[PDB]
């Protein structure tokens, strides 16, 4: 094998892991710190909640008798009622959203480049599986060897593997669905599509057969204590 | 960095 | 029980000792340079046992599963609670007058 310098472990292997871990934490914390809710007026939240109610009605009107459901239908999408008809109305925001979307991967690539410069010329670890030779130019950046096994990796690709393998850990410790990783606007069209969808929907009162399906079995009663 | 540019061009392709 | 938590610690500790042993054995090779290329059976057995026990502890540590049926936790929710409406509280009741003002 190869008698690698022990100091390469104490100053090039572990620091990379620590950097990746804390950079992920930093990135997640900066993401949550930067996020500020945009102010919403009454109309937008009102229409969003109205279409929410309409959709949940479409979803589960089955537990509601037919007349209540078709009265709901009349109220929402029907000329006479009026509802769903008389219900309608470098930029800073684009730059901000583009920067926010960019800051999820670009900092990682910049850190990788900085590491590649800072830690150029080493052999950090041997990958325990026989990688292909064609992957040599990128795994062994900063190494002048020619016949070296492809399983030996430079600092940059080791950092890349580290950053690839730590997202699950981030979700494990930081919390579920953390932001440290690598990866309605229009109501008129929404109104019309809700109109069409709830027009297409039908009714099936799920209570039409609850009694018969209840009479079959006795009521659970144990554990009353 | 040539590496940074060559690895950020796919980032721009992924975004677009 | 909470003791489960303590267990997992020792598992890692056991594993940690194995690591030391492995390192030393590696040094052994790095000082013996013979065609052994094999770990001692004792140390590997110790490592495997540590892995097994630590995973077993983790199994307890993962927690308890939750039932999917939404009508599980709502069974014991009596109507005397859902009707309170904390936002719409009113303080013109007999509680204030009866109790010390």
């Amino acid at each position: 094998e190869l008698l690698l310098d022990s100091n390469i472990r104490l100053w090039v292997v572990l620091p990379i892991v620590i950097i990746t871990f804390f950079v992920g934490m930093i990135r997640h914390y900066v993401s949550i710190l930067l996020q500020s809710d945009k102010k919403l007026t009454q109309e937008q939240v009102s229409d969003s909640q109205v279409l929410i109610r309409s959709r949940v009605l479409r979803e589960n009107g089955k537990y509601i008798p037919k007349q209540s459901f078709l009265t709901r239908k009349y109220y929402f999408n029907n000329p006479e009622d009026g509802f769903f008809k008389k219900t309608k109305r470098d930029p800073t925001m684009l730059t901000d959203m583009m920067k926010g979307n960019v800051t999820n991967v670009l900092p990682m690539i910049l850190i990788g480049g900085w590491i590649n410069m800072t830690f150029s010329g080493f052999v950090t670890t041997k990958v325990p599986f026989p990688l292909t030779l064609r992957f040599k130019p990128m795994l062994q950046q900063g190494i002048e060897l020619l016949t070296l096994d492809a399983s030996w990796v430079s600092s940059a690709s080791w950092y890349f593997l580290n950053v690839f393998g730590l997202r699950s850990i981030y979700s494990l410790i930081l919390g579920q669905d953390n932001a440290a990783d690598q990866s309605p606007a229009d109501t008129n069209k929404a109104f019309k599509t809700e109109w069409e969808a709830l027009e297409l929907t039908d009714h099936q009162w799920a209570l039409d057969d609850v009694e018969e399906e209840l009479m079959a079995k006795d009521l659970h009663f144990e554990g009353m204590f | 960095n040539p590496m940074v540019m060559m690895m950020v061009l796919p980032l721009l392709i992924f975004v677009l | 029980p909470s003791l489960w938590k303590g267990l997992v610690g020792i598992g890692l500790f056991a594993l940690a000792h194995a690591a030391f042993s492995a390192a030393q054995h590696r040094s052994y090779m790095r000082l013996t340079e013979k065609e052994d290329e094999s770990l001692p059976i004792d140390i590997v057995l110790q490592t495997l046992l540590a892995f097994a026990v630590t995973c077993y502890g983790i199994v307890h540590i993962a927690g308890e599963f939750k039932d999917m049926d939404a009508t599980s936790e709502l069974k014991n929710k009596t109507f005397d609670t859902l009707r309170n409406h904390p936002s719409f509280y009113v303080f013109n009741h007999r509680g204030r007058v009866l109790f010390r003002p």
Binding site: - | - | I10, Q46, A52, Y56
Partner: protein
Amino acid sequence: TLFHFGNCFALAYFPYFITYKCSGLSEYNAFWKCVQAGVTYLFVQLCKMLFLATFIGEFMKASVDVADLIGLNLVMSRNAGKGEYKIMVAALGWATAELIMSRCIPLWVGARGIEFDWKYIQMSIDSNISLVHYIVASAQVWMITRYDHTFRPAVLLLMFLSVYKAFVMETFVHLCGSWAALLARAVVTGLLALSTLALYVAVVN
């Protein structure tokens, strides 16, 4: 001597099958419960090996006994039902683990060949009495549980002290024949069995 291996297997496993079918397995379908008990027993064995490595014979035996008792208590708390039946679901799982442990593998590697040592049939006998030993252990666990009264803590402490009786008898035999030693272990295990059933008839109230 494959047919001897057959005879020894018939001696060891079949009483377990008999207990399985005579203890109302269909009451809970204890295959899953038995599997859980066996996993716990394997874990306890792993813990005992780790503890022995960490930490002359009495200390190791005490640690093994403590781990087994703790595992049995945890397994018992894992399931709810008939007291005799939790007794069964614990004892049967642990006993199956013991047979499946290093008292079946030597029976496979040894035996079935040309040699004939009485050790295999003796091991089968001892495994069969191990059934009642684990019955005793489960009785002790149930006594620890099932409320507290009538000098119950004194009896529980005495039963806990009586655990690791196998190591004590082994030490005595080492200080002191193989068939004689096996017989002595059988009689002491039977004495503990009768003590535990006496406790059971005392506690039924």
